[PDB]
Structure formats: structure tokens, C-alpha cells
Amino acid sequence: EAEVQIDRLITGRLQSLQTYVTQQLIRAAEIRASANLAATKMSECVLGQS
Amino acid sequence: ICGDSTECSNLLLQYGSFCTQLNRALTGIAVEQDKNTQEVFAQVKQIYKTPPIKDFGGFNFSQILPDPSKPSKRSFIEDLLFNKVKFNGLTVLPPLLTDEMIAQYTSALLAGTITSGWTFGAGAALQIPFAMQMAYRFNGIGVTQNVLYENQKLIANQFNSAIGKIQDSL
Amino acid sequence: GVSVITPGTNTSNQVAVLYQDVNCTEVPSNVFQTRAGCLIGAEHVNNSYECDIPIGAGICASYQTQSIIAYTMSLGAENSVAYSNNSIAIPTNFTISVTTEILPVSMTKTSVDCTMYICGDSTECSNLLLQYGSFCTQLNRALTGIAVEQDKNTQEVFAQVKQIYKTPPIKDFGGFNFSQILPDPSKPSKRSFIEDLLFNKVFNGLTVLPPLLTDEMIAQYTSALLAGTITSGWTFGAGAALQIPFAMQMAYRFNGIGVTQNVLYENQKLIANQFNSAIGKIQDSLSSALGKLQDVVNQNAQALNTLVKQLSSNFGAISSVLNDILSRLDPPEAEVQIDRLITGRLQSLQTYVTQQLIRAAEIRASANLAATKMSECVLGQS
Amino acid sequence: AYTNSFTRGVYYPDKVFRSSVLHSTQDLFLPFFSNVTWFHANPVLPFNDGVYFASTEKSNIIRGWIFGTTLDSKTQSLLIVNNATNVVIKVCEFQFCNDPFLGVMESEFRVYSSANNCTFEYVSKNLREFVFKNIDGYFKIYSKHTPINLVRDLPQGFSALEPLVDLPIGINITRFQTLLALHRSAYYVGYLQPRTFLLKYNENGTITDAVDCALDPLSETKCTLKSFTVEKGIYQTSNFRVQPTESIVRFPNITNLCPFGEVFNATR
Amino acid sequence: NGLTGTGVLTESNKKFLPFQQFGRDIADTTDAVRDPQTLEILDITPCSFG
Ligand SMILES: *[C@@H]1O[C@H](CO)[C@@H](O[C@@H]2O[C@H](CO)[C@@H](O)[C@H](O)[C@H]2NC(C)=O)[C@H](O)[C@H]1NC(C)=O
Ligand SMILES: *[C@@H]1O[C@H](CO)[C@@H](O[C@@H]2O[C@H](CO)[C@@H](O)[C@H](O)[C@H]2NC(C)=O)[C@H](O)[C@H]1NC(C)=O
Ligand SMILES: *[C@@H]1O[C@H](CO)[C@@H](O[C@@H]2O[C@H](CO)[C@@H](O)[C@H](O)[C@H]2NC(C)=O)[C@H](O)[C@H]1NC(C)=O
Ligand SMILES: *[C@@H]1O[C@H](CO)[C@@H](O)[C@H](O)[C@H]1NC(C)=O
Ligand SMILES: *[C@@H]1O[C@H](CO)[C@@H](O)[C@H](O)[C@H]1NC(C)=O
Ligand SMILES: *[C@@H]1O[C@H](CO)[C@@H](O)[C@H](O)[C@H]1NC(C)=O
Ligand SMILES: *[C@@H]1O[C@H](CO)[C@@H](O)[C@H](O)[C@H]1NC(C)=O
Numbered sequence: 062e063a064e065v066q067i068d069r070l071i072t073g074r075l076q077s078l079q080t081y082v083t084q085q086l087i088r089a090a091e092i093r094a095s096a097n098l099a100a101t102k103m104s105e106c107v108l109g110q111s
Numbered sequence: 112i113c114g115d116s117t118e119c120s121n122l123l124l125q126y127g128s129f130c131t132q133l134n135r136a137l138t139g140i141a142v143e144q145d146k147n148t149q150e151v152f153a154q155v156k157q158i159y160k161t162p163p164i165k166d167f168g169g170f171n172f173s174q175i176l177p178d179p180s181k182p183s184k185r186s187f188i189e190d191l192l193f194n195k196v197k198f199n200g201l202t203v204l205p206p207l208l209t210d211e212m213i214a215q216y217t218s219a220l221l222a223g224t225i226t227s228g229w230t231f232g233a234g235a236a237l238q239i240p241f242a243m244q245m246a247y248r249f250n251g252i253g254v255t256q257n258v259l260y261e262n263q264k265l266i267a268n269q270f271n272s273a274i275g276k277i278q279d280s281l
Numbered sequence: 282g283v284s285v286i287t288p289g290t291n292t293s294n295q296v297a298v299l300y301q302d303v304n305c306t307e308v309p310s311n312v313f314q315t316r317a318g319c320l321i322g323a324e325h326v327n328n329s330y331e332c333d334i335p336i337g338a339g340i341c342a343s344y345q346t347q348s349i350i351a352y353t354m355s356l357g358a359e360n361s362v363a364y365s366n367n368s369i370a371i372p373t374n375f376t377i378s379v380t381t382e383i384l385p386v387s388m389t390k391t392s393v394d395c396t397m398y399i400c401g402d403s404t405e406c407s408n409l410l411l412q413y414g415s416f417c418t419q420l421n422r423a424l425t426g427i428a429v430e431q432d433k434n435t436q437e438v439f440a441q442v443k444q445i446y447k448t449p450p451i452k453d454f455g456g457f458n459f460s461q462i463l464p465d466p467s468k469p470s471k472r473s474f475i476e477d478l479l480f481n482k483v484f485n486g487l488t489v490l491p492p493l494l495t496d497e498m499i500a501q502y503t504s505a506l507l508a509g510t511i512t513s514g515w516t517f518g519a520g521a522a523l524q525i526p527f528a529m530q531m532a533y534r535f536n537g538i539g540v541t542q543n544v545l546y547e548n549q550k551l552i553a554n555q556f557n558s559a560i561g562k563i564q565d566s567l568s569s570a571l572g573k574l575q576d577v578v579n580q581n582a583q584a585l586n587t588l589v590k591q592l593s594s595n596f597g598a599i600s601s602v603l604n605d606i607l608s609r610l611d612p613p614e615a616e617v618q619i620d621r622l623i624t625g626r627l628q629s630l631q632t633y634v635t636q637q638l639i640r641a642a643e644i645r646a647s648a649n650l651a652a653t654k655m656s657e658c659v660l661g662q663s
Numbered sequence: 664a665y666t667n668s669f670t671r672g673v674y675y676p677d678k679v680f681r682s683s684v685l686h687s688t689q690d691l692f693l694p695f696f697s698n699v700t701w702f703h704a705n706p707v708l709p710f711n712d713g714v715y716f717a718s719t720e721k722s723n724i725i726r727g728w729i730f731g732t733t734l735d736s737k738t739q740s741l742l743i744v745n746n747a748t749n750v751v752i753k754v755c756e757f758q759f760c761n762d763p764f765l766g767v768m769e770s771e772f773r774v775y776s777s778a779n780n781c782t783f784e785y786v787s788k789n790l791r792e793f794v795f796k797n798i799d800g801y802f803k804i805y806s807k808h809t810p811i812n813l814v815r816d817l818p819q820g821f822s823a824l825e826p827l828v829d830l831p832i833g834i835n836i837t838r839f840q841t842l843l844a845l846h847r848s849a850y851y852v853g854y855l856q857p858r859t860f861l862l863k864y865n866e867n868g869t870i871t872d873a874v875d876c877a878l879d880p881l882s883e884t885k886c887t888l889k890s891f892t893v894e895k896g897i898y899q900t901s902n903f904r905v906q907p908t909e910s911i912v913r914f915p916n917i918t919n920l921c922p923f924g925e926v927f928n929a930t931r
Numbered sequence: 932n933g934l935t936g937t938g939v940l941t942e943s944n945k946k947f948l949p950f951q952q953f954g955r956d957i958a959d960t961t962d963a964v965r966d967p968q969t970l971e972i973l974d975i976t977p978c979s980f981g
């Protein structure tokens with residue numbers, strides 16, 4: 062009787078974690094594009110004249 | 112998911128490698144965050160230092176050079192910026208670089224620029240006096256370089272006032 | 282968490298263990314406390330080296346000093362500029378240096394057949410699947426959209442010429458020697474000598490589609506770019522190619538960095554010897570580094586294997602085989618067990634398709650940077 | 664005496680061919696670098712979960728084993744024997760000598776004195792390893808015969824054991840013994856526990872190497888990566904969770920308990 | 932004798948051990964069998980699809 066309910070709990074809790082990880086993946090690619098712009102600015106505006 | 116219980120772990124074992132994938136995904140993200148910082152800040156070969164004098168042609172960099180009376184050795188403006196910004200399996204890892212190390216990279220980038228212009232970014236640092244470097248830069252925007260030497264004091268005062276306005280704006 | 286730090290088996294057998302953010306007095310020699318946890322099996326030294334294996338909070342480890350060791354990494358040397366209000370340093374010589382930069386442009390085009398993966402040619406599962414709507418037309422649309430842009434990625438890095446330029450038979454370029462990067466007819470696919478060292482260093486509803494441009498075509502494109510630049514400078518990227526002798530082109534490029542032309546013409550043989558000797562070292566350093574290209578291959582294979590290894594999980598059913606639920610269950614009882622497999626397999630296929638979209642968006646930005654570097658560093662002087 | 668196995672007691676977990684594939688299994692194995700008893704020449708041992716058993720000689724002093732719970736009548740037991748002829752498996756209710764053996768004329772077999780109710784019959788230097796296990800009424804036996812270039816000491820090396828027999832008996836087992844050929848004219852005992860191993864398969868399909876994934880941190884890393892080579896670095900391998908002892912059940916006092924001392928203690 | 936499947940059967944040149952019935956691949960799919968009556972190894976491939 063309990064295995065039936067525990068499988069529902071498992072399904073919900075695994076869906077929540079997948080939502081979390083997918084959004085962290087999408088949010089980290091946005092932070093990387095920003096750090097790439099910062100590296101180019103540090104090279105071109107601090108180590109030279111643009 | 113389960114969390115302590117044991118009836119849960121054997122049932123979750125039936126789903127395959129769903130949890131191994133998620134841990135790989137999160138570990139890749141965490142390894143990328145250190146490479147972000149290495150690529151922005153560790154852009155310098157040596158750790159350069161400013162000389163004990165500050166004869167920079169009337170230009171005053173004291174609000175952005177490091178503060179020797181501090182454990183962190185941050186600058187005044189870096190101190191202003193840093194005052195304005197266990198669970199169910201959740202963990203926070205620390206960054207590889209302390210922010211003492213980051214402040215030490217930034218001060219070396221600053222001393223490279225104030226002392227050598229742009230030569231340290233292409234090879235060995237070659238010293239040049241700061242007014243003459245400022246005059247090289249006036250040439251780069253198409254102004255003739257006596258416009259700098261005949262207006263040095265006014266130009267240095269304008270720089271100093273604009274640097275003073277930034278803290279107030281912060 | 283518990284992490285294991287190894288300086289490599291192909292070197293030693295010792296090891297160290299990090300207990301993450303645990304106070305080192307409640308763990309159960311060398312016990313060392315870090316801002317990142319308790320480290321066991323490495324000794325703490327007072328020196329400071331370049332970082333080897335990153336522990337955290339400024340601490341790295343290495344296999345150096347015998348055993349694993351720890352310490353606070355080194356930012357770098359220490360250079361002290363002798364700055365004064367009337368001193369200048371001016372260079373009296375130069376070196377010609379040449380370095381490499383490696384960039385991924387494409388990944389492999391894969392296709393899946395939803396029905397053959399989830400059901401595997403069985404009409405019972407295939408009829409239950411119809412109740413889920415159009416999930417499996419969306420998955421195929423997504424994979425097709427990312428397999429077309431892989432060919433678009435290559436087309437914009439390499440088809441940056443209109444003509445296929447050829448180099449002259451008698452090759453006197455002022456002492457400069459390009460023989461290790463020019464095409465070689467006796468080689469495979471007419472590749473250059475260095476393009477070979479690079480190509481040597483790196484079931485059920487699943488297929489792999491071939492790329493539109495072969496490797497022969499891409500080597501043809503790079504030899505046309507390389508013969509255009511050796512022979513016309515930067516003129517062919519703005520119009521018709523106009524020939525110029527190679528040392529006069531080198532003198533124009535010296536002008537572009539603010540050196541005068543007599544400095545090239547009076548140092549021609551030295552500059553050419555330095556260039557030849559520096560091209561000779563790329564060949565050694567590679568023949569004896571392509572990790573960014575290896576990683577995208579590895580990631581795709583690791584994902585495709587995880588997709589197939591999921592065809593053998595129950596997800597809460599009596600078996601993983603449809604010929605076993607269709608053999609010891611009557612149709613009213615096998616529906617409930619087939620649906621548990623359908624749900625799991627759909628979840629796994631859709632996870633595969635999301636992570637490929639996120640990985641393709643990253644390969645796309647790399648290819649966009651490679652296309653800009655081909656324009657700005659190969660057809661110009663930046 | 665006691666001795667140290669090095670990498671010994673690996674058997675093919677089952678049929679199914681296989682080639683170069685660092686395949687991972689969970690089963691009952693003899694852990695690497697274990698504490699194996701030493702016997703010279705013997706007594707009643709336990710079983711409790713399978714048994715590794717090696718032996719060394721050129722003559723044949725080791726002449727089979729005897730198994731069971733009581734090694735007598737009133738309950739059933741197995742008997743595996745080998746005279747100078749060939750193997751004799753047998754399952755009856757016996758009466759076993761408390762010191763049973765066979766002689767070497769060449770007349771022998773003072774082993775038992777009873778053979779009642781037989782429910783199964785069968786009839787027909789050196790290092791000889793055996794793995795005995797007993798699951799779901801089946802008594803499985805793996806074995807291997809390697810030639811030593813010593814006479815009677817436990818060597819070092821790797822050699823996987825191939826399945827021999829399968830007996831659908833049903834018998835319960837808790838104890839076992841050995842049988843020796845007397846003088847008239849060296850052996851070890853390991854035990855098996857539930858471990859997880861990483862087996863390396865050849866291209867012909869034989870197990871050539873293995874990794875015990877609970878020996879040390881290096882082995883747990885090799886198991887986590889599924890490889891035999893590990894490059895310098897750091898990897899997440901498991902988790903550390905303190906353990907809680909005892910269960911303290913707190914609660915409130917007992918004010919309005921029960922005044923039963925009125926209905927069960929009335930005067931009238 | 933229990934293994935149910937589909938595909939083309941072909942004469943093999945692998946050598947099982949004389950107690951092994953069928954062979955598996957990495958990623959765990961049956962790819963060889965042994966014929967019970969004649970005891971010869973036969974490879975099994977997925978019907979020509981695509
Ligand atoms: C550089 O500028 C700072 C102002 O930001 C100067 O420091 C201040 O100087 C005034 C008088 O000139 C004092 O009243 C303030 O108390 C100073 N602030 C401090 C010390 O934090 C500094 O003197 C300038 N540098 C030079 C060389 O003149
Ligand atoms: C500039 O540097 C080059 C080295 O890059 C000097 O040439 C070297 O001179 C030494 C000693 O004469 C020789 O052993 C090397 O073979 C030379 N190198 C090459 C590549 O030919 C050159 O002399 C320097 N010029 C000045 C003015 O100092
Ligand atoms: C350009 O450099 C190459 C070296 O990579 C020269 O070719 C080799 O030279 C050596 C030395 O004589 C010979 O042993 C090889 O047989 C040559 N060919 C190879 C390695 O393929 C080449 O001669 C140089 N070009 C000029 C014009 O000097
Ligand atoms: C660990 O516990 C001891 C005992 O209280 C304490 O002195 C020590 O500071 C703790 N560790 C850290 C990192 O604070
Ligand atoms: C490192 O240097 C410090 C200096 O304060 C000293 O106290 C410490 O003992 C040194 N460590 C070792 C391992 O020698
Ligand atoms: C085996 O265990 C016994 C138990 O007392 C111990 O005395 C002996 O030293 C152990 N042997 C080894 C090799 O650890
Ligand atoms: C060997 O022992 C078995 C045990 O019963 C016996 O049946 C057999 O006859 C013996 N061999 C000979 C040659 O008697």
C-alpha cells in the first residue's frame with residue numbers, strides 16, 4: 062500500500078530537481094556570455110586603447 | 112528525494128541514471144565558474160607594484176590604489192562596492208580564488224597601467240612618465256600632443272574631480 | 282561530500298581525501314584544515330607554486346614533495362618597474378612568435394526515431410503512445426533544427442572566399458618557408474603536414490547523419506585562404522586579389538604596428554629565420570593539446586550512451602522487455618505495466634533533447650567567434 | 664597460522680560471453696588482501712556465506728569435503744568424495760565420524776557409518792581453488808586448477824574461477840569439514856561477503872584483472888570513473904553522513920491519569 | 932530457449948566458455964547466441980532498418 066504513494070512522492074520530487082537543474086544550466090550560459098564580454102573589455106580597454 | 116528512509120532508495124534505484132546526470136550537470140556549472148574568474152582577472156604575468164612616491168604629473172590615484180591599513184588591502188572604491196552588494200542535500204562550495212587574490216590581481220593590473228601604459232600587455236613592462244603616456248593617448252584620439260602639455264594642470268584637475276564624483280555617486 | 286585527490290596512477294599510488302566543509306575533528310598522519318573542508322593524506326608546505334589541482338579558497342594540491350602536498354597558490358612572479366618622472370625604456374630587438382588557438386565549430390548530427398526507441402516495433406506499445414499527442418513530432422523537429430545549423434556553422438567559418446586560389450609552382454617568398462602548412466599531394470585528402478598531426482591526435486532508432494562538407498572540401502577551403510594571404514595580403518578579402526611580393530607585404534604589416542619599413546628590410550634574413558624556427562616548434566609541440574575538441578566529442582558520446590543504457594530500467598514495472606509483459610500478463614494488466622515504461626522512456630528521450638539544445642547553443646557561439654577571427658585575423662591585420 | 668590473499672577468489676558471476684568491458688558487478692566475493700586461516704596436516708568450520716578454499720600438493724591428500732548443519736542423522740547433508748577412482752557426490756542422511764577420513768592394501772573410508780534416505784546420488788606442485796555457495800536450493804561450485812612452481816605455500820597472482828556444478832538440493836548448510844588420506848604405508852579457508860567489483864574482460868571473454876571498489880580511495884575512484892587509469896585531479900565519490908544512536912521519546916507528565924481506584928476498589 | 936528477439940542470424944567466429952549461452956554488448960543488448968541443439972555461436976543484428 063505504501064509503495065504506491067512513495068512512487069508519487071518520488072515522481073514529484075524528481076520533476077522539481079530537473080526543473081531546477083535545467084534552469085541553472087540556462088542561467089549559467091548567460092553568466093558565461095557576460096564574463097566573456099568582461100575578458101574582452103579587460104584586454105581591450107585596460108591593456109590598450111580602443 | 113528519499114532522504115534518510117530506505118524504502119525510498121530501493122524504489123529510486125529503479126529509475127536508472129537520472130541522478131548521475133544531474134550531478135554531472137551541476138558539477139560542470141561549478142567548474143565553469145572558476146574559469147570565468149580566471150579568464151577575467153588572471154590576465155597578467157607578474158604582480159606589479161607602484162613605486163613609493165606618487166609623482167604622476169599631478170594625477171591622483173589614491174582612491175583606487177590599495178589601502179595598506181587593511182587585512183584585505185582593498186582600495187577605497189572597492190570597499191564601497193563590497194558594502195552595497197545546511198539543508199536536505201544542498202551544499203555551497205567556496206571559490207578557488209579568495210577575493211583577496213582578486214583584489215591583488217586588480218591592483219597589479221592598475222600598477223601596470225599607471226607605470227607602463229600599454230607595453231606590459233604585449234610583452235615586458237617598459238616604464239614611461241605618466242604625462243608622456245597621456246600625451247601618446249591624446250595622439251590616439253587625433254589631438255595634437257601639445258594640447259596636453261599646455262593644459263596639463265587643468266586636465267589633471269578635471270580627472271581628479273571626476274574621480275571624486277564617483278564615490279559620491281556610489 | 283567526499284572528494285578524492287589523485288596525482289595520477291601512471292605516476293603514483295598515494296592519495297588524499299577532502300571532507301567538504303566538515304570540521305576536521307569529527308571525520309571518523311596529515312590532517313589539515315581548510316576553508317573548504319578537512320584534507321587527509323597531503324602535507325602542508327610553505328612554498329607557493331602554480332596551481333595544479335584546485336582544492337578551493339586559494340588552496341591547491343600537487344604530487345611533488347613523495348606525497349601529495351598542499352599550499353596557497355601563486356598569482357605569479359613579481360616584476361618591479363623602475364618608474365620615475367624622466368625615465369624611459371626602449372626595446373633594441375624583437376622576436377617573431379607564433380602561437381595556436383583551437384576552436385570547435387560543429388558537433389555530430391544525430392537523429393532519433395521516437396517510436397522505435399520507446400516501443401521497438403510492437404503494435405501494443407505503439408497504440409498506447411498515440412494517447413500522448415505530438416511529443417514525438419516536437420522532439421524530431423528539435424533535433425532536425427540543430428542538425429541543420431551544424432552545417433550552417435561550418436559554412437560561415439570556411440566559405441569566406443569566392444575563388445579557389447592556388448599558389449605558384451616556384452615558391453620564393455623572401456626566405457620565409459611555408460612548406461609545413463601548405464597542402465601535400467602525397468598525403469591523405471591533400472592535407473598539409475600539420476593538418477595531419479591534428480587528425481591523428483583527435484542501433485535502435487538512433488542514427489548519425491553525415492556533414493554536408495567532407496573533410497577534403499574543408500581542406501580545400503583552408504588552402505585557398507592560405508594561398509590568398511601568402512600571395513595577395515589582405516586585398517582578396519576586400520575585392521579582387523592583387524599580388525605583392527611577400528617581403529613588401531611584411532613591411533606593410535610592420536608599418537601597421539608602428540615600426541618603420543627599413544627595420545624589416547635590414548633584418549629580413551633574421552626575421553625569416555625566426556619565423557621558420559618558430560613554425561618548426563609548433564610541429565614538435567603537437568607531434569609530441571586538442572582538449573577543447575576532445576571534450577565535445579566525449580560529451581556527445583557520454584550522452585548517447587546514457588540514452589541507450591536507459592532502455593534497461595523498469596521505472597517500476599515487472600521487467601524492461603515488452604516481450605515479457607506481453608507474455609505473462611493479459612492485455613488488461615499489461616497496459617498498466619507498458620504505460621510505466623512509456624512514461625520513463627519519454628522522460629529520458631526528452632531530457633536528451635533538452636541537453637542537446639543547450640550544448641548546441643554553446644557550440645554556436647564558438648563557431649561565431651571562429652568566423653569573426655577568420656575575418657579579422659586571417660583576412661586582415663587586427 | 665593466518666595468511667594474506669592478494670587477489671584471489673574471483674569467479675565468473677554467470678554465463679553470457681563478454682569481451683573488453685570493465686563490467687561492474689555486485690555479488691558475494693572474497694575481499695582483496697584478506698585474512699585467510701591456515702591449516703596443516705581437520706576441524707568443523709562454519710559456512711555462513713559461501714567459502715573460498717585453496718589447497719596445494721602433488722599427491723592427493725585433500726579428498727573432498729562434507730557439508731550440512733549437523734553432519735549426522737536427524738537432518739540431511741551433502742557428501743563429496745574422491746577415492747583413487749573418481750568423484751562421488753551423494754546426498755543422504757548420514758552418521759559421520761567426528762574425525763572422519765580415509766586410509767591408504769590401500770583400504771579406506773572410515774568416513775561415515777550410515778547412508779539412509781538418499782535423495783541424490785552420483786558416481787562415475789598443484790594449486791586447486793574452489794568457491795562454494797548455496798542460494799535458493801542450488802549449491803553452486805566454481806573451481807580452478809593452476810600449477811604452482813612451489814609445493815605448499817599460497818602464491819600471488821590473478822586467476823578467475825569457472826563454474827563447475829549446480830545441484831538443486833534444497834539442503835540447509837551451516838557447517839562443513841574436510842577429508843584427508845592418512846599415512847599407513849596445507850589448505851586455507853576464506854569467507855565471502857557482499858562486495859562490488861570491476862572486472863576487466865579480455866577480447867576472448869576471460870577476466871584478466873579486477874578492482875575491489877572498497878579497498879582504498881584510489882579503488883573507489885577507479886570504480887566511480889569505470890576505468891583502470893586515473894589522471895591527476897579530484898572527483899566526487901560519495902557522501903559522509905554522521906550516524907544517530909538511540910531514540911529519545913519526550914512527552915508530558917500525567918496529571919489526570921485515571922482514578923480507577925474507585926470502580927475497582929469500592930466498598931459496596 | 933527463452934531469448935525472444937528479431938534480426939538476422941549469422942555464423943560467428945567468437946568462442947564462448949562452455950557454460951555461456953548468449954553474449955551481450957556494452958550498453959547491454961544481446962548480440963550473440965548459442966544454438967542449444969548443435970552448440971554453435973551465431974551473431975544477431977537488428978533487421979535492416981533506417
Ligand atoms: C588625492 O585625493 C584625495 C582626496 O580624495 C586627497 O585626500 C584628501 O585631501 C584633503 C585635502 O587635500 C583632506 O582634507 C582629506 O582628508 C583627504 N582625504 C583622505 C586623506 O582620505 C589626497 O591628499 C590626494 N593626494 C595628493 C597627493 O594630494
Ligand atoms: C637580436 O637578437 C638576435 C637573436 O634573436 C641576435 O641574433 C643571434 O645572435 C647570436 C650571437 O651572435 C647567434 O648565436 C644567434 O644565432 C643569432 N640568432 C639568429 C636567429 O640568427 C641578434 O644579434 C640581436 N641583435 C642585436 C643588435 O642585439
Ligand atoms: C622548408 O623547410 C623544410 C623543413 O621542414 C625543408 O624540407 C626538408 O629539409 C630537410 C633538410 O634538407 C630534408 O631532409 C627533407 O627531406 C626536406 N623535406 C621534407 C622534410 O619534407 C625545405 O627544404 C625548406 N624549404 C626551403 C626552400 O629551404
Ligand atoms: C572545530 O571544532 C573545534 C572545537 O570547538 C574548534 O576549535 C575549531 O575552530 C572548529 N573548526 C573550525 C574550522 O572552526
Ligand atoms: C611556515 O611559516 C610560518 C611562519 O609564520 C611558520 O610559523 C610555520 O612553522 C611554517 N610551516 C612549516 C611547515 O614549516
Ligand atoms: C587475522 O585476524 C586475527 C584475529 O586475532 C589476527 O590475530 C591476525 O593478526 C589477523 N591477520 C592479519 C594478516 O591481519
Ligand atoms: C569409490 O567410492 C564410491 C563411494 O560409494 C564407491 O561407490 C566406489 O565403488 C569406489 N570405487 C571402487 C573402485 O570401489
Ligand SMILES: *[C@@H]1O[C@H](CO)[C@@H](O)[C@H](O)[C@H]1NC(C)=O
Pocket residue numbers: 779780
Ligand atoms: C528417513 O529415515 C528414517 C529412518 O530410516 C525413517 O523413519 C523415515 O521415514 C525416512 N524418511 C522418509 C521421508 O521416509
Ligand SMILES: *[C@@H]1O[C@H](CO)[C@@H](O)[C@H](O)[C@H]1NC(C)=O
Pocket residue numbers: 865866867
Ligand atoms: C585469445 O586471446 C589471445 C590474446 O588476447 C589472442 O592472441 C588469441 O587469438 C585469442 N584466441 C585464442 C587463443 O583462441
Ligand SMILES: *[C@@H]1O[C@H](CO)[C@@H](O)[C@H](O)[C@H]1NC(C)=O
Pocket residue numbers: 923924927928
Ligand atoms: C486498589 O487500591 C489498593 C490500595 O490503594 C491498591 O493496592 C490496588 O492497586 C488498587 N486496585 C487497582 C485495580 O487499582
